[PDB]
Design a protein around this ligand. Structure first.
Ligand code: 755
Ligand code: 755
Ligand code: 755
Ligand code: BOG
Ligand code: BOG
Ligand code: BOG
Ligand code: BOG
Ligand code: BOG
Ligand code: BOG
Ligand code: GSH
Ligand code: GSH
Ligand code: GSH
Lengths: 147, 147, 147
């Protein structure tokens, strides 16, 4: 049940929103492929104009990079945040961890796909990693002391 | 324990089968690399014929795309389906969610690696995403109402 | 709580260390990008010397491959190992599963980024996959018998 720990509802809200955000990136990628006529597969290209459309595109590649960075960061959060929710952290402190990650990651996607000037994207990445590092260390201590 | 919720055994069966399915894709990728003599690393190439075999191959790239799409879809399911199992959904309805994803994703890999005509692969992707979207929204409501 | 099962603390220790190890790979990737002046984005390149630095680099690509292989292997472990911890396995046997994966994966990153001769990296990959396959099969039987 969602009320297994005081921090769990907040974690589940933020995590699920971020999963949906990743799904949005996937949809955008597909739409960009269609609009720019840039497909990764010959079977896709032949359906949508001909073999010349099996090609790379800078905007498609950008979408893929944003999606991959999401996989490099959001997936670890899904694990760390879940475990962290059951360590009995301060409700407000836990909320701040999840919110900083949520805001940081949404901002990251906006900065990436919106082609915002450096180092905006890099800063959003680093900001979002901070609560992840914090949770990781807290889990390490709790796990180690229970060995 | 597996009987913590009525939907959990079905989720664990489908998810673990899909993880194994991803492992199979990894093995296939390696086998294709060896057969087509197309390695990503100079150290691999020098062991298997010479430096000229550090090269890209369309079939290897296809395998990597299928594997990456798995990571973009199956990993979120592992999270969403687990949480969803504990929300007390209708046993049959939950089973249908997991089965549609399982069948959709297996079909996706067959359509991708088998080079089936468009839009077969795209349809299997979309079909499998439907129960994921459904579970995501259900988790959102449950999490939000417990805040 | 961490003491929900005898195997859980060991799992959480190994998994969190591996997540941190992935974060280290991400940091290394960024550092290599800066040192070799090889950026994936024009906005990054213009900040760090000019448009000519939006380019690929073999060392950066190697870092990305190591990170991707981590995503292909460590993420499934996070799921499998968590579920496996609650199946009531022998404490020592469970510990061995987690340790073999931890050692195998750390060795994999060292072998990859350190450019060690073949088949060292391939062996570390295979070694680490063994406990994952073992856990997957055990989960399959437990899930199937509870249907
Ligand atoms: C949202 C996604 C699916 C990611 C997207 O927009 N993908 C695009 C990239 C290449 C294929 C294209 C989608 N094409 C189709 C998809 C379906 Cl479900 C049915 C019919 C077609 C068709 O081509 O008629
Ligand atoms: C199933 C996997 C491991 C993914 C696969 O078939 N990988 C292939 C891609 C490039 C390396 C090659 C596997 N090579 C080896 C692997 C081991 Cl464990 C021992 C010895 C060798 C050898 O080269 O003698
Ligand atoms: C550790 C990471 C963030 C992955 C890394 O070393 N990334 C490098 C790859 C390209 C951008 C570069 C980091 N640049 C910055 C990052 C911040 Cl938080 C603030 C200012 C700058 C700056 O450029 O002044
Ligand atoms: C959850 C998905 C987040 C969507 C954020 C997309 C940001 C789009 O932002 C757009 O980027 C374009 C360049 O790509 C610019 O030309 C436009 O000025 C800008 O509005
Ligand atoms: C980036 C560093 C994140 C800081 O993380 C902090 O680490 C401390 C020491 O391990 C802990 O006592 C705190 O609980 C934790 O929030
Ligand atoms: C879990 C892994 C799923 C394996 C599905 C592989 C589908 C292989 O399918 C094969 O594809 C070839 C083109 O690649 C065709 O030439 C063959 O006719 C076809 O049998
Ligand atoms: C694609 C849409 C998936 C539909 O998902 C549905 O959404 C409804 C409204 O949020 C919920 O009441 C249902 O439980 C859910 O199955
Ligand atoms: C958790 C991250 C693991 C870091 C392992 C990095 C291994 C670095 O190893 C280095 O590799 C270089 C080639 O890249 C060689 O030139 C050096 O001799 C070697 O020391
Ligand atoms: C690689 C194979 C991993 C071996 O895995 C083993 O499989 C057996 C049969 O399913 C089980 O009885 C064991 O519990 C399991 O450790
Ligand atoms: N895989 C990443 C590792 C480092 C990283 O996550 N960097 C952040 C901040 S510079 C980023 O937004 N990278 C862009 C990307 O991953 O495409 C990369 O190659 O850049
Ligand atoms: N990363 C995906 C995002 C969109 C997506 O998942 N599309 C589905 C249906 S067209 C797909 O099978 N993509 C092929 C792939 O990911 O390689 C892509 O580039 O296509
Ligand atoms: N995606 C992998 C699938 C197979 C795999 O995981 N192989 C192992 C052992 S050869 C590996 O270290 N691959 C290197 C990599 O993924 O970049 C690949 O292309 O090689």
């Amino acid at each position: 049940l969602v009320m297994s720990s005081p921090a769990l509802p907040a974690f589940l809200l933020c995590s699920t929103l971020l999963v949906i955000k990743m799904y949005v990136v996937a949809i955008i990628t597909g739409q960009v492929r269609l609009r720019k006529k840039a497909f990764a597969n010959p079977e896709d290209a032949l359906r949508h104009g001909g073999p010349q459309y099996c090609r790379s595109d800078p905007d498609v590649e950008r979408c893929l990079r944003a999606h991959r960075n999401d996989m490099e960061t959001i997936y670890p959060f899904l694990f760390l945040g879940f475990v962290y929710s059951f360590l009995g952290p301060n409700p407000f402190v836990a909320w701040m961890h999840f919110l900083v990650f949520l805001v940081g990651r949404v901002a990251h996607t906006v900065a990436y796909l919106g082609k915002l000037r450096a180092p905006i994207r890099s800063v959003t990445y680093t900001l979002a990693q901070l609560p992840c590092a914090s949770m990781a260390l807290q889990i390490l201590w709790e796990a180690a002391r229970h060995l």
